Amino acid sequence: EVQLVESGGGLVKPGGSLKLSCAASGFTFSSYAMSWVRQSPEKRLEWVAEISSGGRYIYYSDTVTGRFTISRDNARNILHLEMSSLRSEDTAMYYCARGEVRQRGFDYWGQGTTLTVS
Amino acid sequence: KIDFVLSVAGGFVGLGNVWRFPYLCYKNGGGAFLIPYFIFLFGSGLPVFFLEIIIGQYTSEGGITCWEKICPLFSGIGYASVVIVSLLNVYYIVILAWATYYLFQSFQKELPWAHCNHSWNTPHCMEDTMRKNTNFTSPVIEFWERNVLSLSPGIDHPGSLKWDLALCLLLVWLVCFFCIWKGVRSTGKVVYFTATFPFAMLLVLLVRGLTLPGAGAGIKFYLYPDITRLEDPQVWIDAGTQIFFSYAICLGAMTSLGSYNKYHNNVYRDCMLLGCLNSGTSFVSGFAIFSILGFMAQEQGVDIADVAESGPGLAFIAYPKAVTMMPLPTFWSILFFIMLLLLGLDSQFVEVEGQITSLVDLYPSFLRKGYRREIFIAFVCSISYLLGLTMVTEGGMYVFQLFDYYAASGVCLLWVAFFECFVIAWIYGGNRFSEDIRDMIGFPPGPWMKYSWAVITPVLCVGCFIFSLVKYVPLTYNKTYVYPNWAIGLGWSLALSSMLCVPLVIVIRLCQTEGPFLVRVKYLLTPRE
Amino acid sequence: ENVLTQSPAIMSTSPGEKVTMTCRASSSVGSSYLHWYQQKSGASPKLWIYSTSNLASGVPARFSGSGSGTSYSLTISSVEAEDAATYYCQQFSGYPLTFGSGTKLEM
Ligand SMILES: [Cl-]
Ligand code: NA
Numbered sequence: 001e002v003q004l005v006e007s008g009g010g011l012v013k014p015g016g017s018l019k020l021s022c023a024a025s026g027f028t029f030s031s032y033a034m035s036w037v038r039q040s041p042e043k044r045l046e047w048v049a050e051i052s053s054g055g056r057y058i059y060y061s062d063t064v065t066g067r068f069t070i071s072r073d074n075a076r077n078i079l080h081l082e083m084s085s086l087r088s089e090d091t092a093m094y095y096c097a098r099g100e101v102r103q104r105g106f107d108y109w110g111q112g113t114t115l116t117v118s
Numbered sequence: 119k120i121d122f123v124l125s126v127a128g129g130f131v132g133l134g135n136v137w138r139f140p141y142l143c144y145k146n147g148g149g150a151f152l153i154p155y156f157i158f159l160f161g162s163g164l165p166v167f168f169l170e171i172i173i174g175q176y177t178s179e180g181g182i183t184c185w186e187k188i189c190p191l192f193s194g195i196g197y198a199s200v201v202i203v204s205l206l207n208v209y210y211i212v213i214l215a216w217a218t219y220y221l222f223q224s225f226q227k228e229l230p231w232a233h234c235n236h237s238w239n240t241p242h243c244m245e246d247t248m249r250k251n252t253n254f255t256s257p258v259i260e261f262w263e264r265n266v267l268s269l270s271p272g273i274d275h276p277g278s279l280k281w282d283l284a285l286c287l288l289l290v291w292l293v294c295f296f297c298i299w300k301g302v303r304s305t306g307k308v309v310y311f312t313a314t315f316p317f318a319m320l321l322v323l324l325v326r327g328l329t330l331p332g333a334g335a336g337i338k339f340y341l342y343p344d345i346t347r348l349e350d351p352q353v354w355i356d357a358g359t360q361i362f363f364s365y366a367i368c369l370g371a372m373t374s375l376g377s378y379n380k381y382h383n384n385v386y387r388d389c390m391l392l393g394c395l396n397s398g399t400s401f402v403s404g405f406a407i408f409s410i411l412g413f414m415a416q417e418q419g420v421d422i423a424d425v426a427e428s429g430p431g432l433a434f435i436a437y438p439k440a441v442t443m444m445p446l447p448t449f450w451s452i453l454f455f456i457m458l459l460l461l462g463l464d465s466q467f468v469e470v471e472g473q474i475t476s477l478v479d480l481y482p483s484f485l486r487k488g489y490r491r492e493i494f495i496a497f498v499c500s501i502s503y504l505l506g507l508t509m510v511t512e513g514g515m516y517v518f519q520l521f522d523y524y525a526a527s528g529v530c531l532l533w534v535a536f537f538e539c540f541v542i543a544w545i546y547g548g549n550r551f552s553e554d555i556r557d558m559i560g561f562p563p564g565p566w567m568k569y570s571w572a573v574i575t576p577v578l579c580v581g582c583f584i585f586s587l588v589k590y591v592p593l594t595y596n597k598t599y600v601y602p603n604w605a606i607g608l609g610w611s612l613a614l615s616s617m618l619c620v621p622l623v624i625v626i627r628l629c630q631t632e633g634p635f636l637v638r639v640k641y642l643l644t645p646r647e
Numbered sequence: 648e649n650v651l652t653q654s655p656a657i658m659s660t661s662p663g664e665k666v667t668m669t670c671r672a673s674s675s676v677g678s679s680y681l682h683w684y685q686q687k688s689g690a691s692p693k694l695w696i697y698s699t700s701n702l703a704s705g706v707p708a709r710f711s712g713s714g715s716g717t718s719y720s721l722t723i724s725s726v727e728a729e730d731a732a733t734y735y736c737q738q739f740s741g742y743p744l745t746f747g748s749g750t751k752l753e754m
Contacts, residue, residue: 030549033556035744045692045735045746053562054553061743062648095691102560102739103698105682109691382677382740560680560739 002026002108004096009113015085016117022079022096022110030054030074032100036081038092039112046092049081050099063089091117122383124313125304127392129375132465133213134364135400136320136458138522140407141432142356147423148339148408150348154357159397161578163361165570166535168389168563169542170367174376175385176554180476181370185541191642192541194623196476198534198616199370203473205612206369206526207466208505211294212518214462215286215510216434219266221455222286229451231261232442238264249418256418258439262431270513273520273605277512284510290463291503297467298474298495304464312460319457320403322450326440327409336412339422340404351586358582359527364396368534369526371472381558410436428597430515430522474498516605519595524609526616529583533617536579543571545643649674649738651747660726660754668750669720670736678715680740686733686749695734696721726752 003025012018020036036048049070050059058070069082079096093114097106143151177184181196223230230236234243234257242255249256263269270277296302304312327333366372379385414425414436426435441450474495478485485494509518524530542551548571552562563571593601593609601609631638654669670681683696685706694703696712699719709724719736731754736747 031562037746043733044749045737047744047746050742050744052553052556054549056550056553057557059742100556100562103679104561105684105694105697105737105739107694109693112691384679 002098004098004108004110006094006096006110006113009094009115011116011118012086014088014117018083018086018115020081020083020094020113020115022081024077024079024096024098027098029072029077032098034072034079035097035099035106036070036079037095037097037106037109039095040092048094051079053100086115086117088117091115123388123391123395125309126375127395128304128313128461128464129468130364130366130372130465131316131396131399131461133210133458133462134360134366135396136316136403136461137213137430137433138363139360139400140404140436141428141430142360143340143404143408144411144426144432145428146353146356147344147348149341150343150345151353151357152341153343153345154354155360158358158361158578159393161570162358162535162539162575163365163367163397164389164393165567166362166367166539166575167365167372167393168386168567169538169571170372171376171379171385171389172551172555172558173542174373175379175381175558177373178377180374180377180472180479182476182479184373187646189541189545189643189645191624191627191639192537192545192620193627194620195534195537195541196370197623198530198619199368199373200473200476201619202526202530202534202616203369203371203469203476204502205521205616207469207473208502209509209518209521209525210462210469211287211290211466211502212506212509212514213430214290214459214466215283215506216266217455217458217462218286218290219283220434220438221452221459223266224448224451224455226448229438229442229447230265231258231438232447233257234260236261236265240264246414246417256414258435258442259427262427262434262438266434267431267515268512269515270511272599272602273513273516274602275513276508279507279511280514284507287503287506287510291499291506293463294466294470295495295499297463298470299492302467312464316457316461317399319454320399320406323437323440323454324402324406326444327406327413330409330413330416330443332413332416333409334412335415336408336410336422337405339412340408350591351582351589352591354582355528355532355586358578359531362531362535363527364400365393366469368531368538369469369472370476371469374472374475375468385559386561406440407432407436410440414439429595430519470498516595516599516601520593520601520605520609521612523593525612528613529586530613530616532579532583533620536576536583537620539571539575539579543576546645548572648743649676649741649745651736651738651745653734653736653747653750655750656748658750658752660731660752662727662754663725665722665724666726666752667720667722668734669718670714670747671719672717672738675716676719676738676740680738681714681719682737682739683712683721684735684737684746686735688732692735728754 005023006020008019008021010018031053033050033053035050038046038048040046047061048064049068051070051072055072060068067084071080093112095112096110098108099106173184177187181199185193185196233245239260240255242253243257243260244254246256268280362368411422411425415422418425426432437454441447441454444450485491508514548568556562592606627642628638631642650673652671660666678699682694684692685695686692695706696702699714700712702710712721714720721734723730731752733749733751735749738745
């Protein structure tokens with residue numbers, strides 16, 4: 001069975017830095033593009049960043065294009081997202097999602113981890 | 119949805135379907151040709167066509183330019199493609215010269231190939247109906263051979279330059295010149311007629327074929343393999359070559375045309391649609407031709423394998439017969455040959471345009487510097503014309519056959535297809551290519567495409583290319599005539615003029631680039647951004 | 648960014664009744680590039696519809712979708728208490744990717 005498990009979420013001061021992790025299992029992690037999607041405390045979803053299957057192509061949302069760096073480790077089968085300067089608006093619950101086929105949405109979602117900027 | 123397919127499909131649906139496939143099928147004994155035909159189709163045909171479209175969209179450059187951004191070492195594939203096109207454009211148009219001559223001969227109260235009281239005929243003639251009653255000859259075949267072709271006894275005997283066909287080549291090249299200069303294309307209101315009329319004519323000829331009393335034997339010959347005798351190398355190369363030629367792959371003009379496409383469309387499904395359309399029209403014209411041949415066997419009293427020329431002239435023997443068995447023959451003759459010209463020219467324009475828009479890359483600051491382009495087109499057309507004249511001499515048929523086999527056909531297409539698939543799958547990386555395709559169209563190629571590029575296509579190409587050189591047999595014009603060794607050398611020269619582009623460019627770019635040898639190799643293997 | 652909005656942000660409903668909800672885009676989205684997700688209360692979202700019409704692997708057959716260009720919709724033939732959830736439409740045609748405002752079935 002497919003598995004996605006985020007980790008590393010926690011408490012930061014405004015302007016701080018934090019790195020998220022998302023372990024993957026049950027599928028050939030190097031063969032699927034991966035995305036991070038963010039849910040606000042208002043429960044509104046927002047997209048963050050996509051990294052391609054290999055890692056040559058990367059896309060960011062305009063609100064994070066200057067601050068967030070996505071990366072992957074195909075050998076370790078883990079997905080990473082690094083936040084440089086977390087603003088007040090960045091507090092949310094972060095999901096990693098499998099997104100290989102754009103004509104098929106995001107196939108599966110992780111349990112997610114909260115992030116707070118108090 | 120239809121508009122795009124209607125506009126573009128005519129570019130490479132053409133004489134490869136209505137003319138080449140039938141005579142290659144007849145040459146190889148009918149139905150035995152179908153097995154390797156479909157094996158190649160579903161193994162390499164559709165996947166490699168999809169790959170070419172992907173390259174075109176990915177790099178937005180012609181053959182000479184695009185490979186720089188994939189694998190600099192194998193940029194020779196671009197020059198191989200351009201020279202293959204530059205040789206195809208020379209001889210492909212000659213078919214339209216014969217079609218034009220037939221059309222101008224059609225303007226008579228009675229067609230010349232209907233009877234043999236006419237002057238050019240041998241004394242051994244009898245009308246087909248009278249051949250029931252030996253060395254007897256049929257009026258259609260000897261019209262083809264002696265009036266239109268005036269066939270000399272060999273390539274060693276070029277004979278006189280036929281003025282009536284030379285002016286036909288001039289006319290067709292002027293049509294191409296003005297159409298390419300003016301930028302005429304299938305986008306006006308004429309598009310519906312130009313794209314639809316050939317298929318209507320094919321339906322007409324299909325129904326005329328199957329209805330004839332001898333059609334059943336022809337279809338039996340068309341659909342019954344003889345695996346126990348005919349699995350020589352000739353049928354395999356002929357089938358693979360037919361697939362590669364009809365889909366115009368390895369020519370580079372496909373990548374040039376694909377560069378104008380839009381990434382928002384489902385390229386995968388459209389590639390499948392185009393492939394099915396083209397292969398279906400070919401397969402159906404197969405029924406039409408071979409039902410007509412079955413009738414010829416019924417009427418003349420000779421075996422199906424012997425009724426007609428086992429060569430390029432088959433269509434100009436089969437259909438001219440068919441239009442002699444329809445009400446008001448002249449009307450159908452005029453329609454058929456106008457249809458054939460409309461079917462061929464719409465594809466000739468596409469290659470010539472690809473040739474020009476690729477050659478400009480060799481000196482864009484000089485050829486594209488301004489008005490020079492209007493003169494460069496005239497130069498290219500002039501040189502192609504003056505090379506075409508060789509095929510219009512009385513011995514020109516043998517030269518045409520030699521070109522049709524070697525110049526843009528046979529082992530050279532296998533060579534270029536092998537190197538395209540090998541580069542992309544193993545040197546560039548199938549995974550990187552799949553990632554690029556994910557970016558472009560949003561989904562990966564999948565297993566069929568992946569294994570077709572990585573394993574199936576290389577294996578098929580190399581297997582045929584080895585099998586023939588093991589079980590080698592030489593070319594012949596008809597079933598009888600054997601070429602002299604010097605003519606075979608010329609044919610191999612035409613073939614090699616394109617094959618050698620890859621090794622020679624590899625050498626050129628290794629020598630030119632600086633550094634130690636492994637640095638040279640690695641620096642030329644790795645893509646440019 | 649192509650902003651997507653959904654019409655009935657909050658919706659009264661009762662078992663057995665039919666239900667329908669709509670998604671609208673600031674720009675045209677191809678039929679193949681709009682998807683719907685279901686989120687149970689306090690749980691991670693799950694893919695529910697992955698084209699104009701195509702149903703996901705586990706969605707009950709009673710769901711359906713429609714639309715093209717700038718407008719889309721999702722419908723339920725006959726609701727049940729198990730369907731009380733929040734549904735988001737999402738476009739996949741061009742980055743940045745955008746999710747709709749989401750719609751909640753309250754009963
Ligand atoms: Cl074909
Ligand atoms: Na074709």
